[PDB]
Symmetry: D2
Subunit: 385 residues, 4 copies
């Protein structure tokens, strides 16, 4: 538990209602969502009604019309409840709706954003492939113009929400020879002829999200399915990832926060040598380092969100947030498990789950390594400035 | 026994034993590791094959059915075995260090014949019941009691977290024979399983080492023969602590195996995965991770072999065992954490074994004394060294 | 706000202090460290600019700024010179801070105002040879006798001891009341019964003086007491809460200048065909230094703004100080590392940044004490 | 104290002999050697008479006839006394005598090893150059063949013992076109015509050692000055560094040991909050971490040493030893400072010196980065084997 730096009442109330939602709707289902690898359909629907799946989306498109600070706060609060619910919400907000928001036509937004703001339909984000994730520009899924259609061939890998999404923002090369000047974004309906979902990934964590390959074999979509112009798909993917990284940062904050909550509450009631673990100096330090890691990571997350909100550049900041929050989430969740001792290793405590859930935040939407590359490039640019 | 160079070039019996165990782990444990994890399946047949190989009773004299090996051999074997499967390794480690260990060290000849020998071949394994629900870190505070009743002890209380609980035919159980004497009032008991008065709690559903069973031993007025006490009354604290010292060598080696296989996985994967036109191992940060993993791992192994070797040479090894277990456990998590990282998306899914090694490594920082406990044990003996 | 648009005053102040640091501190920082030279001239100029009395109101001769401004100035000043930084930090937070918040009108007139312009600076005497972290164990005593407090005991490690003209001194008016028995005293320097110990030969911030305050039958007037008797511990702790924001910002400056040095050097140092910044591990190092520095800065700013907004900030002050101090060591360690051999010698400022960073993990409450402070407030907020 | 499986009685006695020498002869002067940047000439000569400057050197040639395990033990005990004395000694053993023993002719050994075994003359090692300290195969310093002589041109950088050495092993390109394979190693007398010493470096630590550039301007040396064959210089430099890294690892052990010594003794005797520091769990934890890191690095160091003694490969292991021990020295010396509190920041205690001395061990004889590159390289080539 931290000190809201100076939050406006709108985001204060947003935090509370999300926290209330997460504690009422997500905390009791988080264990089943993870153990039964069960997509939290009912809750995602209720979240859509609340505008949580479309926070940055203008209301006239059916969204909540909030900002990315709001999103960061909601994302942390939801992911505190359920990390899977969190990334599901994050994919829809950041990775699916975001690029259609930033790059669609009016027609595209009306048809692909608005039907995906209420929880009845969620989207997904298909950039990674089996051969390339970090090397996103190596996308070898092809899109070929033919007739009134784009013809998509290839396999997209690791698509969060693959098994629940009704639409996908897919990145395919419209020319591989052009490299990352040859990627394009396509709005793809799901399901649609030519599109086979791969087997669900058996995941370490965020087990309530589906992750699967999108398999395009001669998958034909209208020519106006392209998002933006041919070739700007990479920049679309990158800028979407900049915003998304704020969401994953906030997801990581959630996991971190709930792991710290679990560690504290357990340490206050677990007894050692006649007194709570929180009397042990060693436990105190762990808690202190967890709090510091977490609040540090949140300030970075808020910074990136606030920068994006204020139309300031935020790539470095989003990456730092995503990096710090993710490594905090693992570190905190690792230490939550440790503070719980034996109980940290077992399923009748949520700590092992946070640890598993935390792990993913270091990986997708750009691994920690990629985040550091992103940070270093922008740090260096700012110095040559 | 043991020269200092033996730390650097294994005696060839140990080199042979390494190859034998690697071969066994690769052929017998590697193919089933995922299954053992996914299905929380006790590897009964592999434990039996290991028993036939002596791996379940390494330090046990051949006179009693053991391999007649040493702790260096055990550390090496625990590494290779746990490299194949962390669960198998722990099962093996509990039987060697935690069950057989105290009996070889503190038991009478008769107790070794009855309690060690039938547990040397993989047909029966033991377990070690020291922790209790309210206390897993203090080996000096058992609320489970052992009251003397004529030709028997009567055990009452719940031991917590017993690895092999659902497969062990016997338990070294620590109970308080004299609550008032606190840490001077604990005794060690050889307990048959099953036995009247002993109920097993439900299997714990774990993060890893999923092939191992973990459950409480609920003793409700459970009678055991009088001569089931290990050592004398009151010696339970020392027995538990001295068993934990040997066990930590086993856990450290277990962590070495988890770390080594995670590193193996990372290296093989980084060598065969491309990004930005080259193999991951061309990336400097990947090279640095692998280097850090190898360094962490080889350090922890040197610490582990040192602990084993000191035990082999009849030397004190509390601090060195705790250092081994601490170093290897933390290396096992870090190395396995980084193996996941090197695999990227693959490190998060069951296509690859990396997330299993992560989950598996996690336990090594907990059991047989948490890292915090290991640091307390290290500090306390470091300071004793200066005094 | 933080990065997200700093208020115009603060941005201006940042440029002002960056202008000052680069123009007046950067050229002398190496000499200040090497010759353990108190930067009197620079401190006087800083006094003119209001940097020695930033939170102090204009009426008392202060800059009328806030702690966000303070922290910013502290970072920019300490970027230039770490010793200059702590000298300014002691005066602002540790000396002027408690007098502003706890002194009478008369004490503020007599002890704040003459210390707002750089002509006189103060210091802060809490730690003792026997105890620093255990601040409440102050065994220096103050005994009421007549119109006078009688001070006996050694205060240890007093920054600005050899240049300050007043000390906020913490002596126990009754050791049996423990940290309820401590009082805070305005002690002029020099004064009879007060002897300065010899200057500590320090690892870094070598331009600050650090020396013991030896009180032997040292009589000050009865109204030298800051607040009421027994308030000294809370005065010390609340002063340190503010001070930790200053040291956090000193750490930010050392870290930032270590990072500046590292980036600039790696940009121009060639290895295997190109600049060190093309090497991936160098990029990661720099990325981690930047992330450590920025997050710690945010924490620092959080704390500062909290204090400015009259909100609780003990945990946040401690977090800022801990994170910035460890970042400053980590960053300055890696700045050295990035410079290679140049990191180890005086041709480069890196080795000094390393030496200066190290102190930020110690004084105004060790990282360990800070972590306890964080733990206590974290736990209290869950209860 | 730490434990080991055994030391051979030779190495046990040597440990005591060195520990006795360090506490008696080095401990009293270590603060002054550092503070006055004072070359411990007398202690070095006394060590010369003990064999410490020529430990792996055949007795035939005036050396101790010991091995690198003994050397590692002695380096640690010496560096535990004085980090400057340690490096002066390490340079002579590993960097100067080492390559001559390994690659010199019997005559070169007689001329260049034997007069440097007893402390009257010490050597140095001139590999780095101002523009290149991490690339042992890119010497800009040239050695042109001129009949029965070699002519050296260029500046070697950062030469430890530069102002005290009577000889240098100097690496200079004898065929710049051959890059990697066009380095050669040379025995250069000091002083010698054409060799000018640069101004002494003013260093964070090991301030009792001298560090200066070796400026060679048409420096002529006999033909027989070349160590091994032309083009062998990169191999000689690399295998010399392998040996030297064991020495530096050992120096870092001693610095780490004396730092932990200092911290343990201090924490056992400093009270805070009514009890000694060592009753504080975090001090205990620090001490534990320092002890582990120390003894772990020592095992790594002795492994590299014994591998060398047993004429086994040890590039990875020497790099690991040096890497772990140098980072241990810095972390342990950092933590020693912390444990001392204010005392750790001032010359009243030696902690701050250990901190400063430790810092060099992460830099010379291959930075931590290069060590990790070396580790990575050989780990991979082990895997590809
Ligand atoms: C649960 C889950 C959900 C996912 N969901 C989605 C999704 O919804 N949409 C989507 O598009 N993708 C998704 N992904 C893919 C994800 O973003 C990738 O896993 C990630 O980008 C890394 O890619 P990779 O697996 O291909 O690893 P690789 O790219 O192969 O990375 C391997 C390793 O090398 C490192 N590496 C790679 N390149 C470099 C470099 N230049 N320098 C240094 N190190 C480098 C990485 O950091 C990593 O450690 C998901 C993945 C997971 C696990
Ligand atoms: C998978 C598994 C298998 C197990 N198998 C066995 C088995 O076969 N036999 C057996 O006897 N036990 C077993 N255990 C029990 C195990 O050893 C304990 O979980 C462990 O020692 C930690 O104790 P605890 O769980 O009771 O936690 P606690 O003791 O409550 O520990 C909680 C936290 O407090 C810290 N802590 C505790 N004491 C102190 C202290 N003095 N100072 C500072 N910190 C402290 C710990 O480090 C930890 O972070 C097993 C546990 C698990 C999870
Ligand atoms: C350069 C310098 C300038 C200084 N300037 C000033 C000044 O102007 N005014 C002033 O009042 N003081 C000043 N000090 C004192 C400084 O604040 C103290 O050094 C510090 O607050 C406490 O350290 P100590 O030296 O008493 O060491 P100790 O308090 O003995 O600390 C020893 C160790 O115990 C550790 N520790 C771990 N856990 C705990 C715990 N639970 N409780 C206590 N210690 C714990 C500490 O972190 C430290 O590592 C200065 C010190 C230095 C070095
Ligand atoms: C006190 C002292 C004494 C010395 N004594 C000697 C001596 O007796 N003999 C001698 O020959 N030299 C000596 N040196 C030189 C020393 O070995 C070098 O400083 C060291 O090897 C680093 O080289 P550099 O200074 O050129 O730094 P650089 O090589 O410029 O390194 C700068 C940074 O880049 C990193 N880096 C460099 N190459 C790579 C790469 N390929 N991949 C990733 N990161 C990389 C380094 O790790 C470092 O962080 C001494 C140096 C010092 C400071």
């Amino acid at each position: 538990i931290y000190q809201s730096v100076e939050l406006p009442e709108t985001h204060q109330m947003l935090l509370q209602t999300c926290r209330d939602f997460a504690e009422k709707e997500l905390f009791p289902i988080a264990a089943q969502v993870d153990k039964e690898h069960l997509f939290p359909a009912a809750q995602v629907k209720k979240m859509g009604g609340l505008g949580l799946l479309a926070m940055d989306v203008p209301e006239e498109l059916g969204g909540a019309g909030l900002d990315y600070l709001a999103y960061a706060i909601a994302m942390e609060e939801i992911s505190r409840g359920c990390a899977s619910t969190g990334v599901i919400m994050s994919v829809n907000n950041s990775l699916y709706l975001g690029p259609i928001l930033k790059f669609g036509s009016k027609e595209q937004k009306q048809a692909w954003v608005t039907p995906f703001t209420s929880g009845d339909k969620i989207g997904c984000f298909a950039l990674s492939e089996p051969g390339n994730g970090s090397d996103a520009g190596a996308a070898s899924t092809t899109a070929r113009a033919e007739g009134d259609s784009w013809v998509l061939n290839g396999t997209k890998a690791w698509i969060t929400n693959a098994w629940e999404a009704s639409a996908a923002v897919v990145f395919a090369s419209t020319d591989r020879a052009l490299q990352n000047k040859g990627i394009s974004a396509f709005l793809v309906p799901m399901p649609t002829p030519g599109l086979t979902l791969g087997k669900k990934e058996d995941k370490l964590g965020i087990r309530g999200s589906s992750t699967a390959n999108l398999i395009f074999e001669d998958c034909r979509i209208p020519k106006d399915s392209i998002l933006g112009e041919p070739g700007m798909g990479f920049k679309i993917a990158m800028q979407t990832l900049d915003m998304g990284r704020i969401g994953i940062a906030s997801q990581a904050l959630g996991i971190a926060q709930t792991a710290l909550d679990c560690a504290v509450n357990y340490a206050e009631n677990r007894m050692a040598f006649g007194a709570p673990l929180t009397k042990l100096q060693v436990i105190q330090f762990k808690l202190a380092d967890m709090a510091l890691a977490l609040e540090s990571a949140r300030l970075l997350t808020w910074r990136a969100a606030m920068l994006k909100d204020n139309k300031k550049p935020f790539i470095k900041e989003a990456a730092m947030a995503k990096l710090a929050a993710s490594e905090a989430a693992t570190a905190i969740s690792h230490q939550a498990i440790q503070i719980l001792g034996g109980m940290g290793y077992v399923t009748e405590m949520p700590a092992e789950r946070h640890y598993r859930d935390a792990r993913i935040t270091e990986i997708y939407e750009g691994t920690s390594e990629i985040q550091r590359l992103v940070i270093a490039g922008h740090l260096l640019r700012s110095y040559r400035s």
